[PDB]
Write a protein that binds this DNA or RNA. Structure first.
Ligand SMILES: C[C@H](Cn1cnc2c(N)ncnc21)OCP(=O)(O)N[C@@H](CCC(=O)O)C(=O)O
Ligand SMILES: [Mn+2]
Ligand SMILES: [Mn+2]
Lengths: 555, 411
DNA sequence: CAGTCCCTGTTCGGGCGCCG
DNA sequence: GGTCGGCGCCCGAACAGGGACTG
């Protein structure tokens, strides 16, 4: 066996574990002919070699069809070898995006035929990569080979190939610093600002530099004219767009069909603005059956019809100009949903997206807006390496009140106010000082752990009082209920004194939505008020009416 | 031709496997030039995916510094080698460094590149450089010498460092020198003029052995932040209610605090804005509570075997209070910062500055870095803190969300 | 007193999308 | 077909840790 020009990567097994010994599963006669034809050709090319009975290892093997081609792809079920193979550190840190591409004079895309089959495997490790090809007859013993290159299905092959591919491209990039080569596995995106005459030369130089190491660049996969098919997009000289997306329409929807639907909607949201998946993702919750038929809700059908109407119109993105600023604008879509557009020129979006995660049982629009800014910031640093300038639907005075008075440290980068309703605001403000001329309510609540029974009420300075028995409640729910009672039975200005750290901490965060229906009712009462002053006092210390109302609600 | 000191991990622990976080364009360009120059000088060498270990890497600029500085987050690797830099080659901490009039910090991290690293241990110093828009896969490296930011580097270099400082310590026996991570803390009671002159004598003394930057400190001017009670001649129900709640929380630190007579003033169901005159027994209880807060807490002393913990509270208007402790309510030190960089505009820059100032004080006083309880959301902190970091070390931290109770540390 | 539990937040396991 | 790696989203279950009350 000849020595491959590429330096091999030393690979070990995990200490104290042998190679795989799995029996070959039955294959269809149409897949057997495809494997024997490929295994015979790879054996002639030195990619696989025969093994005798001295090799005690075996691993199942199969093959799948290639997309838009008659050739086949050989795959190995190395699920047992990957468990006992040493851990690798993946060098693929992410997926490139066309919004990060800069405009170049010329662009060339070329693929590598049989990429894994042109990179050698460690000689001391080729033993465990043994497979058996069944013949057309079950009584025939079959032919056993071992891999001399990177197999398809081994957990180390992609990490080894990406690092091996980078080492081969290093001398070319070093000699040609003004050439941009986007390297994703074997797919090479080559662009340059050189004249088109010298560009084809450098392309052929690269095709000859890769040929010295066994990497073939077929002219079949060669692309010289736009539009270029790169990473599932359509690259044009001045714009880009995703390849056509097909949403499956089903009269009877299963849970797996919803996962296939939501997945394509998230993929479409990178350029198509306004995609919602809130109502459709509410179908995947609480259900534990992929094949179960699920009916579409009225809100899910409306959300799906809106997404289909957005996918009717053609959208396109633009490329990145490093000479102009990066701008990201956010809009409040629904309740808990947010969308954004990253652009440099108006209406020429580089890309779009959406944020809709629900963090915490109690939140407000300002918190969710801060979370969306951070998600866009990290996303922009990945693609462009810089933080964009934000346009936010929140008043400068509104944000100034929030971040200064909040106990946590929070911050938003350089931004400006854009007046696009609905505007993010604060729905109520707790007073910093007690209100003169306002009734002072001393609230308290308690409950029994066993009987799940409790009381809740208040005592005021004007003699007003109330106690309400509660069933199937907790100490926390009663103390929240006591504050709700004081808000119901008071005027537009009210001073409330509680001893509940739990209830006070929730209200002081100024929430506008809550998973608890009780807190939502408390929020509704707080918006109707004009001045609310909450105050905390220690319990069991005999303070004001808090002691008198503690003894009233103790049972 | 230097012999390597054998280093091993703690028994029953593997190396660090931390993913690299995204980096900005200015930081990646700075890391490429640095790592190319370090590779050309044999300090680092490229590796492959067969190394399962990795440690994040980013770049910083020190205070008033224009040059980028490579910084590795060896926090996970330092935890998995703790028995090395404490049991075998430990560094003593001089108790007189915190008592000096002036202390200067020197960046001597470039001296670690002169000592080779143990071949069997270089596998754990691996790090990956990201690329913008993932144009290329990660460019991996590993260290061939003593890395900057690793707690094993000053321990191995300690023997070489003492023999370099022996001529200077002999001529200046009153000057205290402490080495922590990539920093050298030089303190003296000399006048500010001749103190900087003695620093320059040490810089040229270090340049001969193959060493720049200067950050001045004054530990004698460090003041604590005590618990203070208001001084009012007209108290209301709301004032007394807040006074009792504050004294009740402070009673966990001072067991002699009493609120019995002050609670008797809050017997009725009175309006908050109503003025309440203080009784004769309540005035004595408030005055005695003020005198107790002047006394030091009973039984508070530093334990070298316990970790340091630092809590930070956001007080608004650029005010930031902090307490350092090992056991709850036994604060070894309290303090307050104000008008730091980013005041009245950026909380994350103020908080990042505070963590650096608190960590620096913990190095001078105890020679240990504290674990911070940060009043910030995890996603908010992990998004911006590298944009403002200006130190060669990185302390450990956890995120807390404690809504304000009775403003104990700030009036 | 240590033992719970009520509440809340985080982490991870698993499905899909997409790329090679 | 039911192979691998990367990134993204969605969800629930398991895990983790602090107030408040009780033997
Ligand atoms: C091996 C390398 C990476 N790669 C792609 N797919 C897989 C897979 N399923 N399992 C493991 N590695 C995979 O692929 C690059 P290639 O080999 O040069 N051309 C593709 C054909 C693509 C098509 O037209 O469908 C192939 O033959 O894979
Ligand atoms: Mn290919
Ligand atoms: Mn109560």
């Amino acid at each position: 066996v000849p020595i491959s020009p590429i330096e091999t990567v030393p690979v070990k097994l995990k200490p104290g574990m042998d190679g795989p010994k799995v029996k070959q599963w039955p294959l269809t006669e149409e897949k057997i002919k495809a494997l024997v034809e490929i295994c015979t050709e790879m054996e002639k090319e030195g990619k696989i070699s025969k093994i005798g009975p001295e090799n005690p290892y075996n691993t199942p093997v199969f093959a799948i069809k290639k997309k838009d081609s008659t050739k086949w792809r050989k795959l190995v079920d190395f699920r047992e070898l990957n468990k006992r193979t040493q851990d690798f550190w993946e060098v693929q840190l992410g997926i490139p995006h066309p919004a990060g591409l800069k405009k170049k004079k010329s662009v060339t895309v070329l693929d590598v035929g049989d990429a894994y089959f042109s990179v050698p495997l460690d000689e001391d490790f080729r033993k465990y990569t043994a497979f058996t090809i069944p013949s057309i007859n079950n009584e025939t013993p079959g032919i056993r080979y071992q891999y001399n290159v990177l197999p398809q299905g081994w957990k180390g092959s992609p990490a080894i190939f990406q690092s091996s591919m980078t080492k081969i491209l290093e001398p070319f990039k070093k000699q040609n610093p003004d050439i941009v080569i986007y390297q994703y596995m074997d797919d090479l995106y080559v662009g340059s600002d050189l004249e088109i005459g010298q560009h084809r030369t450098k392309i052929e130089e690269l095709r000859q530099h890769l040929l010295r190491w066994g990497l073939t660049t077929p002219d079949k996969k060669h692309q010289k004219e736009p539009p270029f098919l790169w990473m599932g997009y359509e690259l044009h000289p001045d714009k880009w767009t995703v390849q056509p997306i097909v949403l499956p329409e089903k009269d009877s929807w299963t849970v797996n069909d919803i996962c296939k639907l939501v997945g394509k909607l998230n993929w479409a949201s990178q350029i198509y603005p306004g995609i919602k998946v809130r109502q459709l993702s509410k179908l995947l919750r609480g259900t534990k059956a992929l094949t179960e038929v699920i009916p579409l809700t009225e809100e899910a059908e409306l959300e799906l019809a809106e997404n289909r109407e957005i996918l009717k119109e053609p959208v396109h993105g633009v490329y990145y100009d490093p000479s102009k600023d990066l701008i990201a604008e956010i809009q409040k879509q629904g309740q808990g949903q947010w969308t954004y557009q990253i652009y440099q020129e108006p209406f020429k979006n580089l890309k779009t997206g959406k944020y809709a995660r629900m963090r915490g049982a109690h939140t407000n629009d300002v918190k969710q807006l801060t979370e969306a800014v951070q998600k866009i910031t990290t996303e922009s640093i990945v693609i462009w390496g810089k933080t964009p300038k934000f346009k936010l639907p929140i008043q400068k005075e509104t944000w100034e009140t929030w971040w200064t008075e909040y106990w946590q440290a929070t911050w938003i980068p350089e931004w400006e106010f854009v007046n696009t309703p609905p505007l993010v605001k604060l729905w109520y403000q707790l007073e910093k000082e007690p209100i003169v001329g306002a009734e002072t309510f001393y609230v308290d609540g308690a409950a029994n752990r066993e009987t799940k029974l409790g009381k809740a009420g208040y005592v005021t300075n004007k003699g007003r009082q109330k106690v309400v028995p509660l069933t199937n409640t907790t100490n926390q729910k009663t103390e929240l209920q006591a504050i709700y009672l004081a808000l119901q039975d008071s005027g537009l200005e009210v001073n409330i004194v509680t001893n509940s750290q739990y209830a006070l901490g929730i209200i002081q965060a100024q929430p506008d939505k809550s998973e608890s229906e009780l807190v939502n009712q408390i929020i509704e009462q707080l918006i109707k008020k004009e001045k609310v002053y909450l105050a905390w006092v220690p319990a069991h210390k005999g303070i004001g009416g808090n002691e008198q109302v503690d003894k009233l609600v103790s049972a | 031709p230097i012999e390597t000191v054998p280093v091993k991990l703690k028994p029953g622990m593997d190396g660090p496997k931390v993913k690299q976080w995204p980096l900005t364009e200015e930081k990646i360009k700075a890391l490429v030039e640095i790592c190319t120059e370090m590779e050309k000088e044999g300090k680092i060498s490229k590796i492959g995916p067969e190394n399962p270990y990795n440690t994040p890497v980013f770049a910083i600029k020190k205070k008033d510094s224009t040059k980028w500085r490579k910084l590795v987050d060896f926090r996970e690797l330092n935890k998995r080698t703790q028995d090395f830099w404490e049991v075998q080659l430990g560094i003593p901490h001089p108790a007189g460094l915190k008592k000096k009039k002036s202390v200067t910090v020197l960046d001597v991290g470039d001296a670690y590149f002169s000592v080779p690293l143990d071949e069997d241990f270089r596998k754990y110093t691996a790090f990956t450089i990201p690329s913008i828009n993932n144009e290329t896969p990660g460019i991996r490296y590993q260290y061939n010498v003593l890395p900057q930011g690793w707690k094993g580097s000053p321990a191995i270099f300690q023997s070489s460092m003492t023999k370099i400082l022996e001529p200077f310590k002999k001529q200046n026996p009153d000057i205290v020198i402490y080495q922590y991570m990539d920093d050298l803390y030089v303190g003296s009671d000399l006048e500010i003029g001749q103190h900087r002159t003695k620093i320059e004598e040490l810089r040229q003394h270090l340049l001969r052995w193959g060493l720049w930057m200067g950050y001045e400190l004054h530990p004698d001017k460090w003041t604590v932040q005590p618990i203070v009670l208001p001084e009012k001649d007209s108290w209301t129900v709301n004032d007394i209610q807040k006074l009792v709640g504050k004294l009740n929380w402070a009673s966990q630190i001072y067991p002699g605090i009493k609120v019995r007579q002050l609670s008797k003033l809050l017997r009725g169901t009175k309006a908050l804005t109503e003025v309440i005159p203080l009784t004769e027994e309540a005035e004595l209880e408030l005055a005695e509570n003020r005198e107790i807060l002047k006394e030091p807490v009973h039984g508070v002393y530093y334990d070298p075997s316990k970790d340091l913990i630092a809590e930070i509270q956001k007080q608004g208007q650029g005010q930031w209070t902090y307490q350092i402790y090992q056991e709850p309510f036994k604060n070894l030190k309290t303090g307050k910062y104000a008008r730091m960089r980013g005041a009245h505009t950026n909380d994350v820059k103020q908080l990042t500055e505070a963590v650096q100032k608190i960590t620096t004080e913990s190095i001078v006083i105890w020679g240990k870095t504290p674990k911070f309880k940060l009043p910030i959301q995890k996603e908010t902190w992990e998004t911006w803190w590298t944009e403002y970091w200006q130190a060669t070390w990185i302390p450990e931290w956890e995120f807390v969300n404690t809504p304000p109770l009775v403003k104990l540390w700030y009036q």
